[PDB]
Enzyme design. Sequence first.
Site, PDB file in Angstrom:
ATOM      1  N   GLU A  35      37.606  79.225 -12.399  1.00  0.00           N
ATOM      2  CA  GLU A  35      38.447  78.156 -12.489  1.00  0.00           C
ATOM      3  C   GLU A  35      37.958  77.053 -13.176  1.00  0.00           C
ATOM      4  OE1 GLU A  35      41.460  78.222 -11.363  1.00  0.00           O
ATOM      5  OE2 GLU A  35      41.601  79.909  -9.966  1.00  0.00           O
ATOM      6  N   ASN A  46      49.354  71.953 -15.661  1.00  0.00           N
ATOM      7  CA  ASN A  46      50.426  73.072 -15.432  1.00  0.00           C
ATOM      8  C   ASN A  46      51.538  72.767 -16.125  1.00  0.00           C
ATOM      9  OD1 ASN A  46      49.216  73.168 -12.068  1.00  0.00           O
ATOM     10  ND2 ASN A  46      48.457  74.369 -13.880  1.00  0.00           N
ATOM     11  N   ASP A  52      45.860  70.742 -11.978  1.00  0.00           N
ATOM     12  CA  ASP A  52      44.681  71.275 -11.152  1.00  0.00           C
ATOM     13  C   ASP A  52      43.356  70.570 -11.270  1.00  0.00           C
ATOM     14  OD1 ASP A  52      46.568  73.294 -10.382  1.00  0.00           O
ATOM     15  OD2 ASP A  52      45.380  74.776 -11.568  1.00  0.00           O
ATOM     16  N   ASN A  59      45.787  72.307  -6.921  1.00  0.00           N
ATOM     17  CA  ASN A  59      46.900  71.852  -7.547  1.00  0.00           C
ATOM     18  C   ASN A  59      47.390  70.719  -6.734  1.00  0.00           C
ATOM     19  OD1 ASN A  59      49.591  74.150  -8.794  1.00  0.00           O
ATOM     20  ND2 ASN A  59      49.266  72.164  -8.889  1.00  0.00           N
ATOM     21  N   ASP A 101      45.987  79.426   4.339  1.00  0.00           N
ATOM     22  CA  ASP A 101      47.351  79.041   4.512  1.00  0.00           C
ATOM     23  C   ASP A 101      48.128  80.285   4.441  1.00  0.00           C
ATOM     24  OD1 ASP A 101      49.233  76.891   3.931  1.00  0.00           O
ATOM     25  OD2 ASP A 101      49.654  77.723   2.015  1.00  0.00           O
TER      26      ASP A 101
END
Length: 129
Positions: A35, A46, A52, A59, A101
């Site tokens: 990343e 993005n 990000d 994000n 999540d």
Amino acid sequence: KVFGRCELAAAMKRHGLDNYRGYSLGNWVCAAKFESNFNTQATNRNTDGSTDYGILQINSRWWCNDGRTPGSRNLCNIPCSALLSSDITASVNCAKKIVSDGNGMNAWVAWRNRCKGTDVQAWIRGCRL
């Protein structure tokens, strides 16, 4: 700050990420590697206008507030700048929420495409942990 591999592994472990939601520390280190190349200050725009932030490229569309992502949420309740700190606490706290999540570490596209299924233990090989 640009972490070294074992240094980051150590910092992640200190902040409780080791085996968090069942993801070994190598998984976290591998995700950070691809990343952000371990650079806490990494930022990447993005196509949708979100950005990000940080080691784990969190994000603004969902997780932090940068003031310029219309319609976005801030589910970590933090300015996205906090995610660029040399201290990884905010990034770690937020990643905990992300990985909880529903889709686990698949939230990190680089983890799915470059770490998932691989010998992620190599990332912490040789580290005094």
